Amino acid sequence: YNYDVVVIGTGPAGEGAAMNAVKAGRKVAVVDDRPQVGGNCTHLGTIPSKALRHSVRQIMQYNNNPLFWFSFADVLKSAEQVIAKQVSSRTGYYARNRIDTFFGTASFCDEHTIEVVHLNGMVETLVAKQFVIATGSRPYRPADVDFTHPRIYDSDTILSLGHTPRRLIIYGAGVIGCEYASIFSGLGVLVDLIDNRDQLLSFLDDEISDSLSYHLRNNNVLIRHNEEYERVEGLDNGVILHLKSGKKIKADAFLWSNGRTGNTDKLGLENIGLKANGRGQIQVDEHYRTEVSNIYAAGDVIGWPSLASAAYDQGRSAAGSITENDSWRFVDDVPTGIYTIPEISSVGKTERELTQAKVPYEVGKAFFKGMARAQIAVEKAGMLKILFHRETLEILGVHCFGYQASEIVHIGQAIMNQKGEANTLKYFINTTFNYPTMAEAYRVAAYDGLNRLF
Amino acid sequence: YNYDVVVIGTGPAGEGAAMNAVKAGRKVAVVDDRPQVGGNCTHLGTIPSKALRHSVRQIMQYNNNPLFRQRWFSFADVLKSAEQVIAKQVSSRTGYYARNRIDTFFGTASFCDEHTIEVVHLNGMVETLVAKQFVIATGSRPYRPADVDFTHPRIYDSDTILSLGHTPRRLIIYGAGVIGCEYASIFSGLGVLVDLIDNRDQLLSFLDDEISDSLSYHLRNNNVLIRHNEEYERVEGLDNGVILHLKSGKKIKADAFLWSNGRTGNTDKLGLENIGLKANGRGQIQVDEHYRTEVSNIYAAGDWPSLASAAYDQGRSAAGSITESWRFVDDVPTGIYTIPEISSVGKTERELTQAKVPYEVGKAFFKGMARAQIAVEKAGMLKILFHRETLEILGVHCFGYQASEIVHIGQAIMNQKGEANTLKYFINTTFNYPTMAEAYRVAAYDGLNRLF
Ligand SMILES: Cc1cc2nc3c(=O)[nH]c(=O)nc-3n(C[C@H](O)[C@H](O)[C@H](O)COP(=O)(O)OP(=O)(O)OC[C@H]3O[C@@H](n4cnc5c(N)ncnc54)[C@H](O)[C@@H]3O)c2cc1C
Ligand SMILES: Cc1cc2nc3c(=O)[nH]c(=O)nc-3n(C[C@H](O)[C@H](O)[C@H](O)COP(=O)(O)OP(=O)(O)OC[C@H]3O[C@@H](n4cnc5c(N)ncnc54)[C@H](O)[C@@H]3O)c2cc1C
Secondary structure, three states: OEEEEEEEOOOHHHHHHHHHHHHOOOOEEEEOOOOOOOHHHOOOOHHHHHHHHHHHHHHHHHHOOOOOOOOHHHHHOOHHHHHHHHHHHHHHHHHHOOOEEEOOEEEEOOOOEEEEEOOOOOEEEEEEEEEEEOOOEEEOOOOOOOOOOOOOEEOOHHHHOOOOOOEEEEEOOOHHHHHHHHHHHHHOOEEEEEOOOOOOOOOOOHHHHHHHHHHHHHOOOOOEOOOOEEEEEEOOOOEEEEEOOOOEEEEOOOEEOOOEEEOOOOOOHHHOOOOOOOOOOOOOOOOOEOOOOOEEEOHHHHOOOOOHHHHHHHHHHHHHHHHOOOOOOOOOOOOEEEOOOOEEEEEEOOHHHHHHOOOOEEEEEEEHHHOHHHHHOOOOOOEEEEEEEOOOOOEEEEEEEEOOHHHHHHHHHHHHOOOHHHOOHHHHOOOOOOOOOOOHHHHHHHHHHHOOOO | OEEEEEEEOOOHHHHHHHHHHHHOOOOEEEEEOOOOOOOHHHHOOHHHHHHHHHHHHHHHHHHHOHHHOOOOOOHHHHHHHHHHHHHHHHHHHHHHHHHOOOEEEEOEEEEOOOOEEEEEOOOOOOEEEEEEEEEEOOOEEEOOOOOOOOOOOOOEEOOHHHHOOOOOOEEEEEOOOHHHHHHHHHHHHHOOEEEEEOOOOOOOOOOOHHHHHHHHHHHHHOOOEEEOOOOEEEEEEOOOOEEEEEOOOOEEEEOOOEEOOOEEEOOOOOOHHHOOOOOOOOOOOOOOOOOEOOOOOEEEOOOOOOOHHHHHHHHHHHHHHHHOOOOOOOOOOEEEOOOOEEEEEEOOHHHHHHHOOOEEEEEEEHHHOHHHHHOOOOOOEEEEEEEOOOOOEEEEEEEEOOHHHHHHHHHHHHOOOHHHOOOOHHHHOOOOOOOOOOHHHHHHHHHHOOOO
16 A cells, blocks of 8 residues: 555544644555554543543532442443544544554554554555654553452553452552542542652642642542552452562552553564664654654654643644644643542643742632632632742743643633733733633632732 | 365355255355355356346347337447346345355465365455365366467457457357357347357267257358368457468458367366365366265365256255265256257267167157247257157257256156156146147157057
8 A cells, every 4th residue: 555644553643643644635544453543542541531530520429419339330331432432533533534544553664664464364564655653652561560460450451340449559659540549539449559759749839749649648548658669469359569668568459550661562663773762762853753754753652741632732743744834843831630539730830940940939829619619519629829920920830729620721821822921910800701610710819929919 | 263164166066065064054164266256157157148148039039029120239238237137146145145154255265284275365365264074166267278369359268258348240259169159149149240160070069960950050040150170270369350260271350259168177276286186187176976086075066067057966965975965966957058048868869879779759849839939939849769668768859949948847757767757748747838848748749659
């Protein structure tokens, strides 16, 4: 077969790259080893975890509702229709713009031709001028951990759970680990989160991390800091983890969420002259182009920031660079978002970086406890913090935690991206929002900032 | 994949073998290289030629009927009618396969060992299939000599002739076989000066002399020019017409050319040397009375006599032998579908004369037949050879419209044993009237007059 742009993997990066390329008028093909389109964006990652989290939140609201346990399988059963709808929508998207697909593992043979091998023994060959690599990553699996044990799971096999455990252990304080800890705590299981550092999500703001830790501890998430595993043992009834500090923790299950490794082992990277680091990531430039001129890598496969929306935008920019239609833009200022119960999101500098850089900033706070919308939604916990320059009133950082955090942070991001005097805090006083909504926070927050300035 | 019986070829032999094997309760599968089921019987051989012949008969009757006068048509329009029949037949065969839970694999089959095969499709496929019992029904192809340019647009065979787009003014057919005679009759009915070339001095020497003479007379009266005892020397394809130079020194120029001399077995691609099976010069496979090859678990059936019904029966017999219903297909009623048709069963007059059997001949001419007169097909003849003393039937020959359907009553009477196989049955049995089966009765009486 002959094409112009060939995409590996149908994740957000691959889908975005292929759509931008077909928007340019080229002839484009996509290859994905999964039997269905979507990848970890919909099959094992974002969609199943988010459906589980939303079901857990609804269960929690129902239990605490004055108007009125649940098996894990019943809770997870809400995700199959969502994934079916998403895969149908993406299949229709691909069919309408006429992109041919191949459901098989893709391997490299030269600079222009690839081998697609399916489960039947199918062998096909694709040739194109431009290639996009969006193989993503897989859960990092250390050798000394018996993942074949029925009671030991990773970020993928955890969905195979057939019963809600009495206790559980989570290793790694990453985004996935914290999200799963929050979800399981909502389900009503004593989760023992294990962290290699002293503070949860040290890249976040200190206040937000402290509030998240307080809520997790108040919701049975026993958090142990500064820990490194020594030896994991699987039994008939439970799993026992011996830490290097000497503590032995026994649970009825086990989940590993410490890092991810890029999918490059089966790609045959040596056949083209490219090499991947120990993390399985491919070095790319500001154009998302590797050392090979016609080879482009984008999305989570490159490592940072390993965010599905960020991966989609990175693939879109890589396709724009391939077509050179001015649509390229290096995706660097990604607003971080952690989907625990409740949510967390941030955009821009934190208070620690601002303190280090000696920027004369000021803090405006808005607490969700005194909020009409938050109380009406029965969400008492949460806060919103805005860091703004004292003199120029420019917003240098927005951090929110609580109800609808990710949706709230977008307006602060939009105000942030303005240039010069346009990016000012006083906008929140010169613009009328709706009421009662969560956006009203900004208004209050703005005042709580400008009252601190003399 | 694992199965009990694996058949190669979806023609009548393969389909019959698969159906008989699946009737035994085993798990069976079929493989073929054609993108549709049916085999050469439906896609390139029997069915298209029969549709062409029936359409030619219909247009001939329409032209000759005074009622329809108050009109030559292109070859493509005549051939168009076969597509519907082919589609219906392939749909019926696919339904038969699916209702019986038969696995089909559309790719060329190659032998690896005595129990497994590789299936390769157009796109570099590889599929392994292992089964206890195997059936070979690969059929055959038109024989292609090296010294003729089949790639020439004006030179065709028994398969590529359907690719003709325009009806030629003149045409040459080489080989006086059943296929050659049928195509010569069809093209003569279409209104083309056909120059049939025969290697021997008599058309269809395996038939009775009277039947062959009548067929030759009809072909001569239908613009077909028959040349006897000729062998080709060189076929040259010009831009306007094909010129054939024969060994006798003649040169014949026409607007087309058809080759129908011999058939070649489709065994080269099978790779039988990987299992210890050899193919002769014609590509056939030697088998015993049980349709079994040298290998104990390898069986071959179908494409002598290269008859579709005979191939079907041979395939079913091979399947029965595999499942332990076996019957050696040896006596097949020979049928040539020219205009009019020809059929024969049992011994001919020449063989009876050689063996000095005291027989007698009963004739019933179709010219005096009422149903034949209504059919406006008066040319015909029904000859019955019956033993004089014991009144047993030793041979039945017919040459006329609806010959194949007529011959089956004589065949049914033939297969009876002893006194049951008697000509007097045709005297003591009430037939339908007006039918050409009742002609048998007349023939029987025409025999009983000669008795004394
Ligand atoms: C539990 C969980 C929750 C998450 N929640 C979020 C969230 O809320 N927001 C967010 O932004 N991110 C989230 N993520 C991260 C998200 O999974 C990634 O950011 C996203 O997958 C990045 O897009 P991608 O296309 O690079 O990844 P993928 O979608 O994983 O791309 C890899 C695709 O390529 C295929 N592939 C891989 N190797 C080959 C090969 N050799 N041959 C052929 N095909 C191949 C894979 O089968 C897959 O289809 C979450 C992750 C997890 C585990
Ligand atoms: C013009 C014409 C008219 C005819 N008219 C009549 C008639 O009126 N009556 C009659 O009884 N007979 C007639 N025949 C003869 C008839 O074609 C054969 O008798 C019969 O079809 C053979 O049956 P078969 O299944 O054994 O062979 P086929 O029907 O040829 O079956 C072979 C099948 O297997 C496939 N195949 C071949 N090699 C391989 C391979 N290596 N791997 C996989 N698949 C393979 C072929 O493509 C084909 O589909 C006629 C023939 C011709 C050419």
